[PDB]
Amino acid sequence: GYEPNVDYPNASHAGLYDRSKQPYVDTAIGPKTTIQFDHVFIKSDFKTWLAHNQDEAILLIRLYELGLLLQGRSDSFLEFYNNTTYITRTDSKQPFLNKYGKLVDTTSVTCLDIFLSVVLFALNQIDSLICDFKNTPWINLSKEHKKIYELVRGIFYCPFDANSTASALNVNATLNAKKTIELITCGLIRALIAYANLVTAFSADKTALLHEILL
Amino acid sequence: GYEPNVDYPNASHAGLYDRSKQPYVDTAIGPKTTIQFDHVFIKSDFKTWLAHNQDEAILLIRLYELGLLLQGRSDSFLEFYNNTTYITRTDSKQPFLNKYGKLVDTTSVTCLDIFLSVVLFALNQIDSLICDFKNTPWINLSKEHKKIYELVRGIFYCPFDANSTASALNVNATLNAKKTIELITCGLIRALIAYANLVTAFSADKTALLHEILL
Ligand SMILES: [Ca+2]
Numbered sequence A, B: 001g002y003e004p005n006v007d008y009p010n011a012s013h014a015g016l017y018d019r020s021k022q023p024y025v026d027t028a029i030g031p032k033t034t035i036q037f038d039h040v041f042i043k044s045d046f047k048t049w050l051a052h053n054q055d056e057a058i059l060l061i062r063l064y065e066l067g068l069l070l071q072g073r074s075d076s077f078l079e080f081y082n083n084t085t086y087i088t089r090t091d092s093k094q095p096f097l098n099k100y101g102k103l104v105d106t107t108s109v110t111c112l113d114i115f116l117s118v119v120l121f122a123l124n125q126i127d128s129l130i131c132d133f134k135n136t137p138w139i140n141l142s143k144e145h146k147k148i149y150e151l152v153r154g155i156f157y158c159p160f161d162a163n164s165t166a167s168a169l170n171v172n173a174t175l176n177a178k179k180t181i182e183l184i185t186c187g188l189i190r191a192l193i194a195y196a197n198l199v200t201a202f203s204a205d206k207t208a209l210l211h212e213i214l215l
């Protein structure tokens, strides 16, 4: 287990002993790259994942917002888009980019536990909805899943004889309902693979904390 | 935050102040219900999940075995079914039930970190394979994914004119390949939702440990 380059990464970067695509960022220390428990800090795998996977992080942040609404956290939800500053359009996901930045700035394990718990709550809700939708070929949803269905929906012609369109809707109503579930399932898979990796990084970070706070 | 019943669960069970389906199991203390770091023990959400979700736990154990093979852990793999005792068939999943029991008996955070890391490794492999399979309508897989495909496959007629069958295979070869991916995707979704919940329970257990080992 002897490798001087791994023990001295800045020297490894300086002598070009490695192939890092963004040299020296791996040694930057601040709130954006660490987490802490009881003011004991570690360089965080969780924070590295957020920075390398911004796009997928935004998806999870969008699921956090859904979790708030499903949990009844009214104020947190209704104020989720405040303080954006611009009177014009910017990035289509501007409010979630802003929250992303504040998530990266969060260092306390306590606060980060809350984030992941709400995201998982939303992920479990969506999984439960899809299972209910698909438990019979005839579509029938519980009162609670009918609600989830519309929330996930919003949160995220016969030119030869137009008259025939009207009667084609009865067929196209079911098609639209199923398409929505197929798209929801696609997003759920992507969100789950991202969450699985993010929370394992967080769990490994906690092991490092457990080792550090021992003495 | 005053609720005498939550502070005294055994008394709550005795007076029938709750509706637990298996009263008193929630206060049983042993290796099967705890985890430890540095010989500091906590009652484990992780262990409760395994006990409540045995079926899904076995699926994750099967993915652990796949991860071993993909990581080159030869001995661990080739000995994975030893010490079953019976010369006759028992439960179809007998060796995985045996490993399940030993997983429940494992208390060290260190050992449990290894289990989840290998399972995630297999989950990421399968996700990467599916993405490669579906990146073009014409099926073409990397040399490494061709391998994963067969491993996941194994680890887990025209009666009016039989002659026409032969020429129907060219169509049915692609159909069989796609069916396999659809089934793999179904299992991946189920495994991911289970892993997401299990590792969040594990992460919450580590927070409790962090609180306890402070003093
Ligand atoms: Ca239903």
Ligand SMILES: [Ca+2]
Binding pocket: B131, B132, B133, B134, B135, B136, B139, B140, B141, B142
């Ligand atoms: Ca391909």
